[PDB]
Amino acid sequence: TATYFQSSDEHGFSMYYKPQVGFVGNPMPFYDPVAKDFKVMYLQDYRPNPEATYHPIFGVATKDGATYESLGELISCGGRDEQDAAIGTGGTIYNPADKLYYTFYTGNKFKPSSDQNAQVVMVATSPDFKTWTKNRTFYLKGDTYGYDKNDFRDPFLFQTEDGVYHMLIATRKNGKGHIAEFTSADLKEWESAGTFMTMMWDRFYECPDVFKMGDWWYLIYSEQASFMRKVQYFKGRTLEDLKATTANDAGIWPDNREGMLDSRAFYAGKTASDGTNRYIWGWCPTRAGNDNGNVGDVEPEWAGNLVAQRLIQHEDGTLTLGVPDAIDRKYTSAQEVKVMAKDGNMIESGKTYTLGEGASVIFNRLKVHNKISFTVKTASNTDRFGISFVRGTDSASWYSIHVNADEGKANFEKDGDDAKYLFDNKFNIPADNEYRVTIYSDQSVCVTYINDQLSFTNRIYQMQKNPWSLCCYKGEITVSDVQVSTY
Ligand SMILES: OC[C@H]1O[C@](CO)(OC[C@H]2O[C@@](CO)(OC[C@H]3O[C@](O)(CO)[C@@H](O)[C@@H]3O)[C@@H](O)[C@@H]2O)[C@@H](O)[C@@H]1O
Ligand SMILES: OC[C@H]1O[C@](CO)(OC[C@H]2O[C@@](CO)(OC[C@H]3O[C@](O)(CO)[C@@H](O)[C@@H]3O)[C@@H](O)[C@@H]2O)[C@@H](O)[C@@H]1O
Ligand SMILES: OC[C@H]1O[C@@](CO)(OC[C@H]2O[C@](O)(CO)[C@@H](O)[C@@H]2O)[C@@H](O)[C@@H]1O
Q: What is 368-379 written as a DSSP string?
A: SSEEEEEEEEES
DSSP 8-state code for residue 430? P
CA distance 241 to 218: 10
Cβ atoms of 190 and 181 closer than 8 Å: no
Q: What is the DSSP letter of 300?
A: P
Helix (H) or strand (E) segment spanning residue 328: helix 325-329
Q: What gap in Å lies between CA 444 and CA 460, rounded to an integer?
A: 5
Cα maximum dimension of the chain: 72
End-to-end Cα distance, the chain: 22
436 sits in which H/E element: strand 434-442
Q: ∠ CA 65-71-74 to the nearest 5 degrees? A: 120
Residue 369 annotated in ligand binding: yes
SS3 per residue for 58-93: EEEEECCCCCCEEEEEEECCCCCCCCCCEEEEEEEE
Region for residue 393 given its phi and psi (left: phi exceeds 0; alpha: psi -120 to 50; beta: otherwise): alpha
**One-letter amino acid for residue 343 of the chain:** D
Residue type, 292: N
Q: How far is the CA of 175 from the centre of ligand 3 (A)?
A: 19
125 CB-contact burial (10 Å; exposed 0-12 / middle 13-18 / buried 19+): middle
88 within ligand 1 shell (Cβ under 6 A): yes
How many helical (H) and strand (E) elements, i.e. helices and strands, does the chain have?
Answer: 2, 34
Asked if residue 402 belongs to a known ligand binding site, the reply is no
What is the rounded CA–CA span in Å between residue 191 and residue 60?
32
Within 6 Å (CB) of ligand 3, which residues are found?
201-203, 227
89 Cα–ligand 3 center, Å: 26
E runs forming strands in 314-369:
319-322, 333-335, 339-343, 346-348, 352-356, 360-363
* Residue count of the chain: 487
Name the nearest CA neighbour of 424 among 444, 437, 406, 441. 406
- Tell me if residue 115 falls in helix, strand or coil: coil
Whole-number Cα distances in Å, 62 to 15, 37, 83, 93, 402: 10, 6, 31, 17, 33
Cα(134)–Cα(77) distance, integer angstroms: 10
**Contact in structure between 482 and 337 (CB atoms under 8 Å):** yes
| 302 Cα to the center of ligand 3, angstroms | 22
Nearest ligand, CA 46: 1
Q: Which atom of ligand 3 is nearest to the CA of 202?
A: 15
